[model samples]
Target: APGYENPAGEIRTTVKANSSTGNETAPAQVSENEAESGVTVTDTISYTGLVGGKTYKVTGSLNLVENGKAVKVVVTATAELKADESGKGSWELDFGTIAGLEEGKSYVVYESARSLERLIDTDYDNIPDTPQNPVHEDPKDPAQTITVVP
Candidate 1:
């Protein structure tokens, strides 16, 4: 439908890829686990990668995969993109919060269109750590998935 932002879902995998480079930016994450603030089950769809960041026709969708059956729930978030080095990026898509989201539920999320970025080493000690997915030449094409958390 036009002009509609669906309710959020279970999980979100932080994605990343450079437009020109078209590969993992050394450390940009493909999927990650970072505690968000003041929220049970929700994220503001943020993309922080390159210096003069770009915008995306963001679409966020969720599915239930606990019982070997995938169920589509409320999804889709649209926001024009633009950001900077300080990482003042887009605010993502949905807002109203996902219903029936709880702990121990196995849910999966799919990123729409395509784009890329993520990283590890929260301290940025200039060392590679286990983070995101393996190096991808084109991050956008691969729909990264991350299981929802509590």
Candidate 2:
């Protein structure tokens, strides 16, 4: 019904360090690329919590359970955790391709929502310090659980 579709499971998710939900031990993986049909698909989300000068992003969403859906974020990647990534302190999220994602279905990739995001900077333009742009301070804080296949 769509145009292209992709799949092959291998979604291992964890962002656990639970400093009372302002969590960070950041590690993620979402894999796909063993295609078989007449179409395409690609995804790889490798993550690390870098802190050499302070800059990072790994937002949330992809809860698309068909009857309950989403699109939530970036990185050097996308399937929407490696969902959101910036730099200054950069790790890896080698993302480049995305098409009609539907391998088995039940995507719930909401990785460490960053406690409303303010990984602080004093004033260096990695842009944080509780302004409305990267401001949530507590976007209901709850994530890190994804697996959809078979």
Candidate 3:
């Protein structure tokens, strides 16, 4: 909820010059204060709202735009869901491929879902409770039904 909002969900990648090209000093650091160069990164949620014990397929597209032109970078990331007592859901994405990272630049480290089965309970309780409940659905499920349930 808090950290999962727009712009928050968005990852801002900046390019830094590691070393000066002879005369110019290397980009010291990429900060929020750095001019964005009109570049905007967008992440689109291809899949979300997953239920417990159910497999969720999620894909996000990263768009890099400068001036008026935009290009989509192949971003392979995973969206993990965490819930809390408030029943609000939050997501954490691990971008396996850091798309816009420049070779000589350094990035400041900043803040950073699954499947279900049907009816076949190995416990043989005959009740459809093996997987328990979705963390968002019920936060107090002793099995830690969901991590970071909020």
lDDT of each: 0.35, 0.30, 0.27
Provide the TM-score for each candidate, comma-separated. 0.35, 0.22, 0.28
1-150, model 3: which lDDT tens digit per residue? 122211111222222122111112222332222222221222222222333234333333332333323343433344543323332344434443232443232222111223233322444455443331221111121111101101
Pick the winner on lDDT between candidates 1 and 2: 1
**Per-residue lDDT of model 2, residues 54-128, tens digit only:** 333434333443444444432222222222233212222322333443455433334332323444444555544
Model 1, runs deviating above 4 Å: 1-40, 44-53, 67-69, 83-93, 102-104, 113-150
Who wins the TM-score comparison? Answer: 1
**Reference-based lDDT, residue 149, model 3:** 8
Superposing every Cα of model 3 onto the true structure, what RMSD results? 16.7
The backbone clash count of each candidate, in order, is: 11, 6, 9
Better of 2 and 3 by TM-score: 3
Q: Top model by lDDT, which number?
A: 1
Candidate 3 segments exceeding 4 Å error = 1-55, 79-87, 97-150
Against the hidden true structure, what lDDT does model 2 obtain?
Answer: 0.30
Residue 113 displacement in candidate 2 (angstroms): 6.1
